[PDB]
Motif scaffolding. Structure first.
Motif: not given
Ligand SMILES: [Ca+2]
Ligand SMILES: [Ca+2]
Ligand SMILES: [Ca+2]
Ligand SMILES: [Ca+2]
Ligand SMILES: [Ca+2]
Ligand SMILES: [Ca+2]
Ligand SMILES: [Ca+2]
Ligand SMILES: [Ca+2]
Ligand SMILES: [Ca+2]
Ligand SMILES: [Mg+2]
Ligand SMILES: [Mg+2]
Ligand SMILES: [Zn+2]
Ligand SMILES: [Zn+2]
Lengths: 108, 87, 86, 104
Positions: C30, C60-65
């Motif tokens: 994170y 790169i997928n902007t999922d927070g980690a």
């Protein structure tokens, strides 16, 4: 619409067909993810689908924020990983010359 | 026979190879190839970044091409952007 | 018995897990974890970009980690930057 | 020097041990690559034609040489492959590593 745009739309539309069922409409809970894998990935995850604990670990691994749902952002990494894995299989034991694809994931 | 979803994923492989098989390394999309890919395959809100900007962003090892794993970075980015626009 | 090179690659897996096993998803670093990783593992010319800048670049997928694949982007970029320096 | 920095230096020093021998001192030719594979990747890469084609795949600019930038993608790929083996068939729950490439 480009081929690539169509493929991304298929990914988005598939995800949302399952994510709207229950709870939060933009995430997959375990039940929704298992159904998607069981039907929509029945060939790509054929071996994994035989062991529910493997499927659950896959979801746990993809559940980036650890909240027990898959957002579309978390889900698309499964799509990238499986696309990568299919292409890897098409090149398993590749001797050349030139470029050739063996059958990909869920085939052969 | 593959599912609708599985066909979309194998199609992403085919899309990449439409450009990677143009010349040279079979798993390399050179800078000029990527401009062609973006102009053909991606929507305006993706292309507007500029092909040069995308290339610099995607060629993470600065070896002059976008290989298949670097291309999947683009696919991930386009899919999340399309999702945000749609929803 | 692993070679010197293979040991280095194995160690890269271990370095990532030092931070990804701190909390939550076992293959997720994170934003606060990545600050610690960069401050501890990366040289000044890498850190000077800023932890938040690196985090935006790597997620790169902007999922927070930063998952393990995303971390390998950092390893590749650090490796090429170290090579160009030396 | 951090553990990560040390691991990257090992990669750089190993590549340049082979690349300086012959021809361009910053790139590996196919024979140099094969020798590196045979000796330095003897566990992680366990057919001669397949190794030649791995080099052709890694040879991004198609000049039949491997630069360091091209080479480090093999390093990333093999690090990934080892971790994947560590999690092959993983049922969890929780996190654990089976042996990686060349082990177990
Ligand atoms: Ca149905
Ligand atoms: Ca269906
Ligand atoms: Ca989640
Ligand atoms: Ca391969
Ligand atoms: Ca090419
Ligand atoms: Ca590249
Ligand atoms: Ca991420
Ligand atoms: Ca040389
Ligand atoms: Ca080359
Ligand atoms: Mg839901
Ligand atoms: Mg974590
Ligand atoms: Zn291919
Ligand atoms: Zn792990």
């Amino acid at each position: 619409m480009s081929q690539l745009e169509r493929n991304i739309e298929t990914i988005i539309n598939t995800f949302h067909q399952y994510s709207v069922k229950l709870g939060h409409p933009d995430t997959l809970n375990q039940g929704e993810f298992k159904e998607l894998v069981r039907k929509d990935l029945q060939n790509f995850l054929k071996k994994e689908n035989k062991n529910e604990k493997v499927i659950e670990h896959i979801m746990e691994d993809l559940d980036t924020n650890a909240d027990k749902q898959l957002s579309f952002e978390e889900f698309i990494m499964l799509m990238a990983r499986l696309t990568w894995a299919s292409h890897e299989k098409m090149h398993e034991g590749d001797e050349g010359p030139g470029h050739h694809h063996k059958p990909g994931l869920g085939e052969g | 026979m593959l599912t609708e979803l599985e066909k979309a994923l194998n199609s992403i492989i085919d899309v990449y190879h439409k450009y990677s098989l143009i010349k040279g390394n079979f798993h390399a999309v050179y800078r000029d190839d990527l401009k062609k890919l973006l102009e053909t395959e991606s929507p305006q809100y993706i292309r507007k970044k500029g092909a040069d900007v995308w290339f610099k962003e995607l060629d993470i090892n600065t070896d002059g091409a976008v290989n298949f794993q670097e291309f999947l970075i683009l696919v991930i980015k386009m899919g999340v952007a399309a999702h945000k626009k749609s929803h």
